[PDB]
Amino acid sequence: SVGIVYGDQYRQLCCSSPKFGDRYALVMDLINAYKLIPELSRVPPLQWDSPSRMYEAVTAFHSTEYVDALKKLQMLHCEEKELTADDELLMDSFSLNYDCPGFPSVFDYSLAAVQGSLAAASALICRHCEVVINWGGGWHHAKRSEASGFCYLNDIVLAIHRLVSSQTRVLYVDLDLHHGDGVEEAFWYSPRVVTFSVHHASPGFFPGTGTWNPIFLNGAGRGRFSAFNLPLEEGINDLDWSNAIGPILDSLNIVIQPSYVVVQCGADCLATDPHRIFRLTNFYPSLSGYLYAIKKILSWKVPTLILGGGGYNFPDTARLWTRVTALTIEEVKGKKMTISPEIPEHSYFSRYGPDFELDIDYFDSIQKHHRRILEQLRNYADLNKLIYDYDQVYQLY
Ligand SMILES: O=C(NO)c1cccc(C(=O)Nc2ccccc2)c1
Ligand SMILES: [K+]
Ligand SMILES: [K+]
Ligand SMILES: [Zn+2]
Structure with a gap:
């Protein structure tokens, strides 16, 4: 089946942050408005037997002291009184400040994504679902003891850890506009989790990694060559973005033969995102780079986790994630999803004005990266004794 994470409490928590507002509600309600919910298996978020079991799960990646501080931040933001200087300094030591502020539900909000993505991983492991979607997850920037980029807990890392610990290899594909630094770092020393991020990178652009640092770092210790990156200049359209990552994706699957694929599908590469950097679309006849990438990953018939961001x-x-959801139903179940170009009437219909259409309202370096990435993949296969056909992988590019 195709699973999707939702629930009443989950929805409330995913809509409780100042930065992401009610985005999750719009996403789930548009999926509902297009009558996709009956096609999908609801995956309930994970809950725990006790505080200690919860800490055991979250501190599989995060430090106890960081989790403590994040919970304290929520507590402090539920009281009317301003933080003390000592508490401000404590929060600063975990980067729980500036762009990762406190708010009254910050811990419950952050933990909810973890609950959803851990449940999604478990549904893949027990083979209840062949693909699971979590549009409340995908928070790729959070580090062991540091919040970053409005990511407080790294649900992706925790989900991947569950998968790899269930020879199991996981391929992580990060389609967000931003470099997936938190996930890359978590698995920097781990050959069995290969990370691949395609992103914009340029001087001063967040978070700064995923590019020449100069040479290209790619993992360390036994994880050498296991962290892949494709930085792209601003302005790239669907076709060029698709041709840039298509052969890399196919080569990674052929060589790594992953037992699971985890995809972060952050929508900030859309031409209409306020970042205004890439020119991708949700068009489904150019073909949306996102839909091209998802279709290609699902054609591998590997159990797959699809996350937001x-x-x-x-x-x-x-608009985009509704089409990703319909495409996943089509590719996995084999059942055609016919979607009207009109946004159906529903709770948030007015938010889609004035056009009320499903299509968004939008009218050599890469060759060098391919040669570099192919060489790195050969080095990865050599170091990890993976038998693969070099000529066939070269033909993909
Ligand atoms: O998406 C991210 N990382 O995957 C990210 C990380 C840090 C900051 C922002 C950020 O604030 N972006 C933004 C730009 C313009 C308008 C509204 C929001 C986004
Ligand atoms: K990315
Ligand atoms: K790795
Ligand atoms: Zn992003």
């Missing part, structure tokens, strides 16, 4: 044009993010 960035996306700051909330209606267009719902």
Whole structure:
């Protein structure tokens, strides 16, 4: 089946943050408005037997002291009184400040994504679902003891850890506009989790990694060559973005033969995202780079976790992820999803004006990266004794 994470409490928590507002509600309600919910298996978020079991799960990646501080931040933001200087300094030591502020539900909000993505991983492991979608997850920037980029807990890392610990290899594909630094770092020393991020990178652009640092770092220790990156200049359209990552994706699957694929599908590469950097679309006849990538990953018939992430044009993010959800149903079940070009009437219909259409309202370096990435993949296969056909992989590019 195709699973999707939702629930009443989950929805409330995913809509409780100042940065992402009600985005998750728009996403799930547009999926509902297009009558996709009956096609999908609801995956309930994971809950625990006790505080200690919860800490045991979250501190599989995060430090106890960081989790403590994040919970304290929520507590402090539920009281009217201003933080003490000592508490401000404590929060600063975990980067729980500036772009990762406190708010009254910050811990419950952050933990909810973890609950959803851990449940999604478990549904894949027990083979209840062949693919699971979590549009409340995908928070790729959070580090062991540091919040970053409005990511407080790294649900992706925790989900991947569950998968790899269930020879199991996981391929992580990060389609967000931003470099997936938190996930890359978590598995920097781990050959069995290969990370691949395609992203914009340029001087001063967040978070700064995923590019020449100069040479290209790619993992360390036994994880050498296991972290892949494709930085792209601003302005790239569906076709060029698709041709840039298509052969890399196919080569990674052929060589790594992953037992699971985890995809972060942040929507901030859309031409209409307020970042205004890439020119991708949700068009489904150019073909949306996102849909091209997802279709290609699902053609591998590997159990796959599809997560959300960035996306700051909330209606267009719902437009894109609704099409990703329909495409996943089609590819996995084999059942054609016919979707009207009109946004159906529903709770948030007015948010899609004035056009009220499903299509978003939008009218050599890469060759060098391919040669570099192919060489790195050969080095990865050699170091990890993976038998693969070099000529066939070369023909993909
Ligand atoms: O998506 C991200 N990382 O995957 C990310 C990380 C840090 C900051 C922002 C950010 O604030 N973006 C934004 C730009 C313009 C308008 C609204 C929001 C986004
Ligand atoms: K990315
Ligand atoms: K790795
Ligand atoms: Zn992003």
